[PDB]
Every structure is written in C-alpha cells, then in structure tokens.
Symmetry: C4
Subunit: 89 residues, 4 copies
C-alpha cells in the first residue's frame, strides 16, 4: 500500500506536518530532502516509521542536518525503502 | 471505475466520513482497517456497498471489531473485491 | 492531456460545478451519470466540450434526462470519447 | 521525481500561483498554455526552473505572449522537458 517516493511542492513555517502511514510489515526508513528557490537542497533528514503504524512529522521539529528557516517557502521530497502513504496537512 | 485499495493517512474523531461510490454491477464487499501511531491496527470493519450506489460511512459509527477512540489521530486502509471510488470528507 | 473517465464520489445541491478542460484538437463528447445511495443511476447527461476550450458545467443546470433533486448527496461519473481534465469545484 | 505534463482546469485572477519543484539535476524548460471557454489558447509562456530549486510562478505576472485578462476563468497546461512537481495554490 502506497509509494516509495512522495513530493510536496509547497511548505512553510510561520515566523507544517506530513502524516505518514506504513501499512506494511517492514519498518520504513524514510529520508526527507528540503528544496528552496535560491539555495541547494538540505538533507537527508532521516526517520523510521514502524511496521503497521502512522507517524506525524512536523517540519518545524526537523533539525539534523539543520533546522528549516522560518518564514521561507520550501518544497520536500520524501523517500522510503518500502511503500508508504503520505498526506500533507 | 476506481480502485480496489484506497488509503487515508489522517483521520480524527473529535471528543469523519468516507463517501464510497460503486459504479459497477457487482456488490462491493469492503474491508476497512484502522492504523494508529502506538498500537497494532484494528479491523477488518466489513460493509457492503451495493451495485450502482453510493454509500457514506461515518468512522464514528464503526463498532465491529471495536469503536475507534475519540480524540485520537488514525489512518485507514479501505479494500474492496471490486473497484470503487473513495473520497474522504 | 487527461483521461477519458473521471469520478466524483460526493456532490450536493443545497435546497456544485465541474470545470472541464479539452486541451485536444477534437471535440469532447461527454456523458455524465449521476449515482445515488438508494436508487438506480440517472443519465447519460450529454454535452460537448469544444477542441482547445474549457467548459464549466453546473450540476444544478442539468435537466435531460431529469433534474437532480436538491438537498440530496450524489456522486458522478464523467466519460468522454477523448482525454479531458476535470476539476470539481 | 514528478511528471513532464501537468494540467490545472480552473484558474482565476480577481479584478493565482503554481509552485513548481525541479528536484532533478537538469534545468527545467517550462511552457505554460492558457485555455479559455470562448477563444483559442494563448502561449507558450516560457520560463526556466533551475536544477534542484523551487520556483513560484504568479499567473498575474505572465505577460509574454500577452497578459491574462482579469476576472476571467481559465485553465492551464504546464509542460517541461524534464519531470517536475506542480502544486496549484
């Protein structure tokens, strides 16, 4: 159930959440990359979504490799080793 | 018309509806599974969507195998033996 | 550009518009069928979307084979002989 | 990541933005065509989205071959030589 690559063309943290579902039996090793209008992309931000669980990820909580600056439009690519379902809220 | 597997990565019942269309000539035997961030999934919740009809299903009305707790973020996978069209409202 | 079959699982006329784009060089002969929770589907409602034009269709304006009753949830299937792009507003 | 052809069946400038992401390593040479209910399409409007960057394009800022009239419903087709991701805001 789902796909191993998702993209979100607009993101913004005011001066921002992806709901992920891994309905499968293997843990999802997820890698997020943040894109900008005027600089190189930052990432991967790495996290695990456990087998048969949801996980909400707040863009504001991401910090490794670096925090996402606030008041800045960005886009994001989310890649997983196993199919997941992503909804941007 | 439609697909036999649909996923909804974010659901919530405040302390929540899927509109299903079976445009086909066979009844749809539908199975919903609810996923959580911190426990195993619950289901299948089973229902029939008749040939050439819509059916609205309220998540709050589901009760077999168990009611969905309120004030709790969940996701859902909806599977059918025949193609259906699902919209989350 | 687009597809020849589109479905909209929830529609409602209070007691409702599809924006269609035919980016192609042939006229689109479109057929809409309305589905209900408790009776057989009604249609086809037939219309033409000209080559390289948009057309907005209000569900409230449809009348042949019959008007859609108000205050009634419905779904719709839109079929075309040529690819079109449909957005429900 | 993404597709080389995107369509947006409803656009309107009051008397309107596409967020584009090129997550790839080649620049995206993008061509927008505007469609109307009652006249021939206008375009291509041409722009470049750089490798590994986002770009927001305001429909109100487009002017070559011609400005889009205000208070007028339109649709748009966006074509690229390389896959991009488009979100209409």
């Amino acid at each position: 159930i789902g796909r191993t690559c998702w993209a979100i063309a607009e993101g913004y943290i005011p001066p921002e959440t992806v709901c992920i579902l891994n309905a499968g039996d293997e843990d999802a090793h997820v890698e997020i990359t943040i894109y900008y209008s005027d600089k190189e992309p930052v990432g991967p931000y790495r996290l695990t979504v456990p087998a048969r669980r949801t996980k909400h990820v707040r863009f504001n909580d991401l910090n490794d490799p670096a925090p996402i600056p606030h008041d800045t439009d960005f886009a994001s690519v989310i890649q997983s080793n196993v199919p997941i379902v992503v909804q941007h809220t």
